[PDB]
């Protein structure tokens, strides 16, 4: 079971994570998610 | 420094205003539980980029609201 | 034009805009075309928003298809700076705090 | 003007064609001349050519749009048209808009 869809940012986003062993790593924010336009990457690890 | 049965609930708010990105976060020990939590500001970044879409990186469940 | 497509200051902005003439250093007899300004963009930029993407601009019903065409122009138009050019067209350096 | 197929070339210097209707200008000046296709490039700001040097001169800092369309059907005849003239020889380079 893996769900990782691209979701429209809209005005703003609230993210809540219930997790064990911190499987979720981070978030990517971009207009078109490609090299053509600048994108924001946040990766969280130990 | 890193932000870090399911015993962990991570609440994050992402806002882009005036080219400044706001992340508000609170971590709660645990369908979302019915409770009141106020999210403290974590960091503000001058990204200065248009954001129209977002994706989540996964190496449980997550909740997205607008 | 710059405000709409290059740099936009928020209406409630608090700070200082500092500008000095840079004709001596930023202009050459050969001319300086390194500096660029974006004449064409689909929508006005939000305050403190930077667009660096270079893509052909479609101003006509016919699709550019990633090639220059009638009503299709490169977004960035190079500035032309000459010592001969009179004040008001000379390069100016602006730092906004 | 854009809609018509003949006006293939619509080069604008220092102005945006998209905003031409939006922008408001005090006066518009139209100059009409016929040149060969090879020498069309000469009619540009800061461009040196025989036509540019001695016939029509554009200033280095020029705000406007140049419109060029092929006139083969209108200006070409089986006999040929010799009415059009160009100034091959001039003592000095023409000043802009002279
Ligand atoms: C400061 C910032 O990122 N503003 C952007 C804006 O440029 C864009 O037009 C809009 C989506 O339409 O999303 C927001």
């Amino acid at each position: 079971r893996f769900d990782n869809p691209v979701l429209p940012f809209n005005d703003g986003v609230y993210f809540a994570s219930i997790e064990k062993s911190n499987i979720i790593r981070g978030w990517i924010f971009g207009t078109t998610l490609d090299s053509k336009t600048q994108s924001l990457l946040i990766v969280n690890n130990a | 420094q890193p932000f870090l049965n399911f015993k962990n609930l991570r609440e994050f708010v992402f806002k882009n205003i005036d080219g400044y990105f706001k992340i508000y976060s609170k971590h709660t020990p645990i369908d979302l539980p019915q409770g009141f939590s106020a999210l403290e500001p974590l960091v503000d970044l001058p990204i200065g980029i248009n954001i129209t879409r977002f994706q989540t990186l996964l190496a449980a469940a997550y909740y997205v609201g607008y | 034009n710059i405000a709409d497509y290059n740099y936009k200051l928020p209406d409630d902005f608090t700070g200082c805009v500092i500008a000095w003439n840079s004709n001596k250093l930023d202009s050459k007899v050969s001319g300086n075309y390194n500096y660029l300004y974006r004449l064409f963009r689909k929508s006005n930029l939000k305050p403190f928003e930077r667009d660096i993407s270079t893509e052909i601009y479609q101003a006509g019903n016919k699709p550019c298809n990633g090639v220059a065409g009638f009503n299709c122009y490169f977004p960035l138009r190079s500035y032309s700076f000459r010592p001969t050019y009179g004040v008001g067209h000379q390069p100016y350096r602006v730092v906004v705090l | 003007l854009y809609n018509l197929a003949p006006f293939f070339t619509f080069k604008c210097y220092g102005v945006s064609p998209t905003k031409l209707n939006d922008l408001c200008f005090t006066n518009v000046y139209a100059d009409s001349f016929v040149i060969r296709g090879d020498e069309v490039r000469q009619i540009a700001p800061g461009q040196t050519g025989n036509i540019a040097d001695y016939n029509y001169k554009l200033p280095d800092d020029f705000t406007g749009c140049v419109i060029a369309w092929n006139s083969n059907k209108l200006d070409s005849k089986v006999s040929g048209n010799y009415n059009y003239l160009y100034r091959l020889f001039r003592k000095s380079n023409l000043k802009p808009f002279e």
Side-chain angles (χ1 to χ4, degrees):
Chain A
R1 272 293 295 176
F2 195 87
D3 293 347
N4 200 356
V6 189
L7 301 147
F9 190 71
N10 297 345
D11 300 348
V13 159
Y14 163 75
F15 205 86
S17 308
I18 61 165
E19 196 92 10
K20 47 184 177 187
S21 69
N22 48 78
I23 301 289
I24 301 184
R25 296 283 70 184
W27 320 272
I28 305 294
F29 306 87
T31 305
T32 182
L33 268 295
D34 63 350
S35 290
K36 285 78 181 179
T37 64
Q38 197 149 356
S39 43
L40 168 64
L41 186 147
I42 307 178
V43 172
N44 188 30
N45 52 25
Chain B
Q1 292 293 328
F3 310 146
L4 295 161
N5 192 20
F6 320 100
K7 288 300 184 61
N8 289 335
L9 171 60
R10 320 190 318 174
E11 310 185 39
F12 287 85
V13 163
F14 308 112
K15 292 166 50 188
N16 207 359
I17 312 178
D18 284 358
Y20 184 67
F21 196 65
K22 296 73 168 160
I23 305 185
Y24 300 82
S25 180
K26 152 163 286 174
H27 289 75
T28 308
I30 44 171
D31 176 33
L32 277 165
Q34 182 169 4
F36 185 88
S37 292
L39 270 51
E40 311 175 8
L42 199 174
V43 63
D44 221 334
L45 306 170
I47 61 172
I49 61 153
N50 170 21
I51 302 175
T52 306
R53 274 136 45 94
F54 74 97
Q55 200 175 0
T56 301
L57 307 167
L58 304 162
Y62 62 91
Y63 306 89
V64 59
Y66 305 121
Chain C
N1 300 344
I2 73 177
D4 297 352
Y5 294 156
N6 293 321
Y7 185 82
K8 186 60 179 59
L9 273 180
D11 295 353
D12 59 341
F13 160 77
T14 179
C16 303
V17 286
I18 319 292
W20 58 98
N21 185 26
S22 56
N23 196 37
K24 298 294 297 300
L25 183 64
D26 290 9
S27 174
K28 299 190 301 299
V29 54
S30 57
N32 207 348
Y33 295 88
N34 304 350
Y35 298 125
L36 312 163
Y37 61 89
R38 184 179 299 262
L39 291 178
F40 306 97
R41 200 191 182 270
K42 261 150 186 179
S43 62
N44 293 8
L45 275 180
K46 284 294 172 66
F48 291 152
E49 176 52 30
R50 180 193 306 100
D51 186 22
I52 61 174
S53 181
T54 56
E55 290 294 326
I56 190 71
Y57 178 74
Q58 192 183 344
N61 300 352
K62 307 177 181 180
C64 311
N65 284 342
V67 191
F70 319 129
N71 281 324
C72 296
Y73 312 101
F74 195 72
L76 306 183
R77 285 310 179 182
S78 59
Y79 274 110
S80 56
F81 289 136
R82 298 281 170 165
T84 66
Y85 280 174
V87 294
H89 283 269
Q90 292 179 1
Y92 268 69
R93 274 185 171 185
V94 181
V95 168
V96 179
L97 298 160
Chain D
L1 311 174
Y2 159 68
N3 292 345
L4 279 66
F7 309 157
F8 319 108
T9 304
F10 193 26
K11 295 177 296 179
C12 290
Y13 315 103
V15 183
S16 297
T18 70
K19 70 170 172 50
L20 291 183
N21 56 337
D22 305 342
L23 206 51
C24 191
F25 304 98
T26 309
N27 289 315
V28 180
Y29 296 101
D31 298 328
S32 58
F33 48 87
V34 170
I35 53 184
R36 66 161 49 94
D38 294 333
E39 291 170 334
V40 70
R41 45 88 172 171
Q42 304 185 353
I43 308 296
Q47 168 44 254
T48 55
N50 199 289
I51 291 301
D53 297 342
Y54 319 110
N55 300 49
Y56 180 69
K57 192 62 175 302
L58 272 184
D60 296 358
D61 196 7
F62 162 69
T63 52
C65 297
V66 297
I67 304 95
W69 58 98
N70 195 12
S71 187
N72 185 44
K73 304 298 294 299
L74 311 168
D75 289 337
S76 292
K77 305 193 304 169
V78 69
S79 59
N81 198 12
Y82 315 105
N83 300 350
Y84 288 104
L85 292 163
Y86 60 94
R87 184 171 301 268
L88 190 58
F89 306 105
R90 217 189 85 91
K91 300 180 180 180
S92 59
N93 197 323
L94 264 182
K95 299 298 294 299
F97 287 131
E98 191 183 4

